[PDB]
Nucleic acid binder design. Structure first.
Ligand SMILES: *O[C@H]1[C@H](O)[C@@H](N)[C@@H](O[C@H]2[C@H](O[C@@H]3O[C@H](CO)[C@@H](O[C@H]4O[C@@H](CN)[C@@H](O)[C@H](O)[C@H]4N)[C@H]3O)[C@@H](O)[C@H](N)C[C@@H]2N)O[C@@H]1CO
Ligand SMILES: NC[C@@H]1O[C@H](O[C@H]2[C@@H](O)[C@H](O[C@@H]3[C@@H](O)[C@H](N)C[C@H](N)[C@H]3O[C@H]3O[C@H](CO)[C@@H](O)[C@H](O)[C@H]3N)O[C@@H]2CO)[C@H](N)[C@@H](O)[C@@H]1O
Ligand SMILES: [Mg+2]
Ligand SMILES: [Mg+2]
Ligand SMILES: [Mg+2]
Lengths: 113, 154, 68, 197, 96
RNA sequence: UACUUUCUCGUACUGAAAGGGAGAUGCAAAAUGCAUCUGUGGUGUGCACACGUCAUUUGCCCAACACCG
RNA sequence: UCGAACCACCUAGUAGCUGGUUCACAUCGAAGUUUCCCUCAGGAUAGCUGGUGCUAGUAGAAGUAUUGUGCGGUAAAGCAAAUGAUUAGAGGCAUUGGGACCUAUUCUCAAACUUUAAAUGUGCAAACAAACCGGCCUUAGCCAACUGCAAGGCCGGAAAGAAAAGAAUUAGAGGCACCAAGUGGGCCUUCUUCGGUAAGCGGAGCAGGCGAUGCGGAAUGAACCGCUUAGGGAUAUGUGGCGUCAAAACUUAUGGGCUCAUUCUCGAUACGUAAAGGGUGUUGGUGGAUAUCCACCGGCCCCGAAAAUGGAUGACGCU
RNA sequence: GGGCGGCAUAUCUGUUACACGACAACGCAGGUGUCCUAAGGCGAGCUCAGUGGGAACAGAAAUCUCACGUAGAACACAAGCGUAAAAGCUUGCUUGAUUAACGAUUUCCAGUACGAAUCGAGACUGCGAAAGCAAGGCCAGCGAUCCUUUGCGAAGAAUAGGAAAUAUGAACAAAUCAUACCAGAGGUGUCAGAAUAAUUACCACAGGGAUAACUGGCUUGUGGCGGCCAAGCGUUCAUAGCGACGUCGCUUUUUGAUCCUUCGAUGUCGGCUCUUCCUAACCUAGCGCCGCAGAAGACGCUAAGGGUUGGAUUGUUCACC
RNA sequence: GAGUACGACCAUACUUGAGUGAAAACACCAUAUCCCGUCCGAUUUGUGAAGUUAAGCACUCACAGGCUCAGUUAGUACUGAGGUCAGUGAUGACUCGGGAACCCUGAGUGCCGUACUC
């Protein structure tokens, strides 16, 4: 599905900006925003994931509960990037935007979060 | 294909492989098929008797019937919006036993190999480390990838 | 006059709206009618013993309740 | 902007209110919608949801059916406990074919005039759902029953009746009319009484 | 298609229940009798003024009819009808 | 409006017709076997409820489905 | 009033054909395909669709991967391997008659040829009605027999609920049923493809679209590009743009080259509707030779290049 | 478009068909309505097509013998598969080409019927020492209700309709007769199945641009007009003027092909009249070039400003004087 | 280290031409009264035991043909996804992946099972 997606390798600040600013949770089948770590601890019920730094831990360093944290959250809905996109219709190597960025995806997401 | 008979478009399909001709072998007769077993219907011309239809040639399903020279086998055929289960009946040369569950009976018997070394003894084969970790590279040979001029003259 | 003969265009998109309904499991509708008959008549002899064993086991489970 | 393709097909039909015009069913729906939310009992969940259901989906039970399944539970009941209160959301009819029955305590949505008599003549008791909300208000020591929906005429007509496997009944006011072609092997074919799956 | 005038077959009649000699005649249809039920109905429908009242088939396409052999057993003289395929010429002869 | 009586549909189907006509269990094997009459024909899956356990084990299984008798 | 008068009637004859069919909002939302039909402007049928639900809310889930294990003969390859074609030289010398024949090679091919053989696909399995491990009961199943085999139960055991090796993921409630609409003229497109000289032609395959749907862009365009649509704001984008029309480089750079064209007037937004050939116009390259020649190759520009209302990179214009 | 022609109307192998399966066209290449008492069934023995060496008459070919021979033969037939102590050939005995309790299934598919086929169980058998194989010749070769018609339901038992005797003609009974239930047959090739000749220019109705004749559109085979290459023509010589074999194209004043628009109507030829446009220039204005001495003229360039007739015949465009 | 009988995979086992072969066994070989079958005691059937490893069989050897297996061909041909890519077009490259085939070259030239025997 490469013509439809732009992927890459996140940093620690890309994870914690996405979890804090635009990270929400699937609580009672509803999309509620992370406001306190009590609401995270009430969601996962794992005694290893009790705060918002537990979720950026399991995401950034995979851990035993990468799936339960990411299936815990709603899909992140970002803004379009400020400053634009170069070409949607071509790969990143061809001079456009889709495909893999071997850690360059951080500056592209830093214009969206 | 201008005709809709039973063997139509089966020119290359019901043929035999090059220097693989002949009547079926004795290890096909001795291979005993049991009800409830996954078999693998592959139509064997040089028998020409009790062949499956051309649809059931790569297919593999469960035996439900064993008669003296016949095997019934339940094979899924998707029709419009549903996958109904066709119970065909072939001669016994047109089935092979299926090795589909070979990799599952292998890690099942590895789970009685383990649990027979944990509860009683202690001797285990070690767990395998991933090759995707970050090691150091000791270069025993280096080249230069450079696209020489003489690479074009061919 | 002449029209369009045969097409398979929309059909695969029509077939997946209510899904391709998958096959059903092997414990549903596993009728042995039409199977090889000497082994079918044998298995009836056995099920008529397994039913009267089930009538006797449940009756024996009641006397192990009225005494305890 | 969301790619929600098969998302209306995941929806189901629930119908939280009743279609009935009876003012006494609406009082039980006033009572059991209260108990369904204000109690952790799964009894009041099921008794509220089965009370909403239509009159076709509240198929009635027979008194000889209550007398057999209460027998097969009182077989493995310790005899220090009494017996459950049989509760059906629907009608109890009498059964001619079962003369003597034990003293059972039945809560139904309506009884016959004769099913009421044969319960109380056996030493039993016909209850009602306002009276079941007082003794066992959460359904402790009850036995919830339904009543049979197969065996109906309409269910016996559901099907094609001329494709193989189908033994449904044709819609025919004349019984000896649709009995010839496609129903006897001598009259060019007869639909196959059995088909696998 | 040559066919023998004798044929050894099963007879299934509990006086036989065994392979016995049959003899072969051929099936030729009997004369359509008046005072059959559908013939009396047809004579009642035709009488009057409407003309011809049932369809009368013209467009014959078969040039050939199926062969039915009546097989009378030697033991118990009981006919058994069997059918053979469509052939244009059929003959019974003992010559081989 | 109030009130009162055979006819019809249904409780039993099947066969072309003459016709025949469906409970369970136990003993048991009699070309109408005998005795009981508080009873799901049996097995798999299966709301509620009854007794334990953990952060479901089991009993009965209602409605239902499948496989049989 | 005549190739069958006029009047009343039967008669509001019948029409698979044409025309019409009267309020609002909301929730969902298609089909031009299958099979049969004196059927091809129509139906019945399955499908897509709505309504009603029912059943124990993750269950018997999947237009997807991964690992294991099967199926294939299309693209390519080959003719130095069979069959079908098809050029040409080499001599074998007795195997012959006015290249036959043989042996090794060769030039060139195959929708109805093939040794081999992809990519894309396609089947099954991947632990909760299940398989796994040690007795028992039953069977007029199998075998000489049972202690073996096959079958259906019963009893007890174990159970990373599936390890580690990249070792899945899911806006993943599963399974049933009733009732019934509209449709059954399609059309366009990337790719594969058939008939045709061709076609805005005819017919197919996989998918996506229009039909039925606007909106933002390509000046204009059912179908292209972007995006998909409750009533409104703010910010930021996408496709496409930034000399004026016309929002934006008040004609941006403190970037590089190339280009000159004199009566449908160089050129210039894809889809989208001029070639062979030529040039001592200019600007780069390559290989040879003695500051000058020679053979080649590319970029832009010119020639090749002729139609019927006045005319069109959208207009002005731009060098 | 319809008509003629045809069959793509029921159906079979190869290909189209895009390595599961499924896929269209009056797409390509051929078949089908029959044939067989053996050309079925089975057992035994054998090896085929062809070539090579040999043997009176006897040759390329008659028949004997030997060798090699993966099938190059054969299997009734179209084709494809398959096959060598065989599936072929010869021989020997045979009738499994019968019956087959309404078993189940596949292909076509609506998961209906039909046709064909597969895996069974039961009776009686055939061949074989046996294991086995055989209920046609694999795979195409065929057909509803209604009606006609045939076969089976031997007689002989039964104090009684049953475990066992086919049944009815309805107030009874006998004997005829008809009927019923079961399995076939006689047929519908338009092959899921009405019993069917034209004509209409005297014509009609409901419709259709789902569909033809006129224009327009697309295409440009065909018809008009060129360029490129240069074998040749021109006494000499490629090009003054031409230019085969090829080749690349322009043109929409022809015609074909299509079926987009119009069938609740776009008045369907040619003259006559009148105006304008285009250039691929016949005359006129400038020219270049010649196999251009002059005179006439060939070829070409810039140019469409202006001019481009009177008649005989023909309805004519055209043609022809 | 071999034989024989039954064998499983079915050429790494085949084809051609040489070479060698202890024992024992296979095998040619001898024969025609019975059993049996032929134009023919050839095959086949019976009954044998004088002879020979000539041949079969076995093994070994060929700049043998074949077969088998890697390698090369070759990241080549081809192909899945992409573009308001390039080119009048034919078609080509690029980008994210998958990835052949013959020729050619090297290797070696059967392997496993049961019973009986030397
Ligand atoms: O009974 C059958 C059922 O009718 C049929 N749909 C299917 O069930 C599927 C199931 O499909 C859903 O069934 C729902 C209704 O039956 C339907 O939901 C949608 O239906 C429309 C109207 N009926 C809409 O109004 C609405 O969008 C929505 N309710 C289907 O989504 C699937 O969800 C399951 N995955 C599989 C079932 N097989 O099959 C039944 C079997 O008889
Ligand atoms: N067999 C176990 C028991 O079956 C019961 O149900 C049994 C019967 O009550 C029930 O029979 C019903 C009958 O009640 C009702 N009046 C009519 C209905 N058609 C029958 O149903 C059954 O009978 C017909 C007979 O042909 C079958 O075709 C059908 O498949 C089957 N569902 O079906 C089962 C017969 O095998 C209950 N589910 C329960 O008490 C218990 O599980
Ligand atoms: Mg009834
Ligand atoms: Mg759109
Ligand atoms: Mg008749």
């Amino acid at each position: 599905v490469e013509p439809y997606i732009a992927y890459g390798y996140p940093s620690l600040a890309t994870v914690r900006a996405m979890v804090y600013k635009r990270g929400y949770l699937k609580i009672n089948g509803q999309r509620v925003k992370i406001t306190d770590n009590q609401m995270i601890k009430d969601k996962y019920n794992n005694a290893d994931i009790v705060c918002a730094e537990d979720m950026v831990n399991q995401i950034y360093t995979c851990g035993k509960h990468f799936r339960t944290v990411t299936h815990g959250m709603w899909p992140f809905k970002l803004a379009p990037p400020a400053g634009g996109m170069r070409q949607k219709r071509r790969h990143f190597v061809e001079g456009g935007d889709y495909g893999n960025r071997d850690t360059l995806i951080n500056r592209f997401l830093a214009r969206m979060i | 294909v201008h005709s809709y008979g039973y063997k139509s478009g089966t020119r290359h399909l019901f043929a035999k492989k090059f220097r693989k001709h002949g009547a079926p072998s004795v290890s096909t007769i001795l291979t005993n098929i049991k009800v409830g077993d996954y078999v693998d219907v592959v139509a064997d011309s040089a028998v020409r008797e009790g062949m499956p239809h051309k649809y059931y040639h790569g297919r593999t399903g469960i035996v439900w019937n064993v008669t003296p020279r016949g095997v019934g086998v339940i094979i899924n055929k998707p029709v419009r919006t549903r996958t109904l289960r066709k119970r065909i009946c072939v001669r016994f040369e047109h089935v092979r036993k299926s090795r589909c569950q070979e990799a599952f009976k292998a890690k099942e018997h590895q789970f009685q190999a383990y649990l027979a070394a944990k509860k009683a003894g202690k001797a285990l084969p070690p767990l395998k480390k991933s090759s995707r970790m970050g090691g150091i590279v000791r270069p025993k040979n280096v080249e230069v990838l450079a696209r020489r001029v003489a690479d074009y003259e061919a | 006059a002449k029209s369009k003969n045969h097409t398979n265009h929309n059909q695969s998109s029509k077939n997946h709206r209510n899904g391709i309904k998958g096959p059903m499991p092997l414990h549903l509708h596993n009728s042995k009618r039409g199977s090889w008959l000497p082994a079918l008549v044998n298995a009836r002899r056995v099920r008529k013993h397994n039913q009267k064993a089930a009538l006797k086991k449940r009756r024996e489970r009641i006397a192990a309740f009225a005494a305890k | 902007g969301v790619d929600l393709t098969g998302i209306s097909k995941k929806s189901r039909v629930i119908r939280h209110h009743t279609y009935s015009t009876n003012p006494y069913i609406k009082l039980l729906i006033k009572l059991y919608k209260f108990l369904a939310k204000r109690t952790s009992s799964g009894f009041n969940k099921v008794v509220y949801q089965r009370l909403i259901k239509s009159r076709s989906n509240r198929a009635p039970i027979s008194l000889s059916r209550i007398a057999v399944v209460m027998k097969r539970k009182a077989v493995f009941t310790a005899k220090s406990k009494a017996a459950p209160i049989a509760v059906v959301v629907g009608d109890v009819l009498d059964d001619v074919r079962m003369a003597r029955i034990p003293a059972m305590r039945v809560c139904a949505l309506r009884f016959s005039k004769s099913a009421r008599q044969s319960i109380v003549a056996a030493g039993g008791e016909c209850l009602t759902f306002d009276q079941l909300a007082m003794i066992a208000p959460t359904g402790k020591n009850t036995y919830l029953l339904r009543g049979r929906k197969s065996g109906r005429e309409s269910v016996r007509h559901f099907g094609a009746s001329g494709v193989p496997g189908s033994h449904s009944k044709p819609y025919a006011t004349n019984r000896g009319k649709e009995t010839k072609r496609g129903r006897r092997t001598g009259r060019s074919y007869k639909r196959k009484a059995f088909r696998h799956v | 298609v040559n066919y023998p005038k004798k044929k050894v077959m099963h007879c299934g009649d509990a006086r036989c229940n065994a392979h016995k000699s049959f003899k072969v005649v051929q099936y030729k249809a009997g004369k359509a009798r008046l005072f059959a039920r559908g013939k009396r109905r047809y004579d009642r429908k035709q009488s009057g003024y409407g003309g011809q009242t049932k369809p009368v088939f013209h467009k014959k396409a078969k040039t050939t009819k199926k062969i039915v052999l009546k097989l009378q057993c030697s033991g118990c003289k009981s006919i058994r009808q069997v059918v053979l395929k469509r052939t244009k010429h059929f003959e019974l002869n003992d010559k081989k």
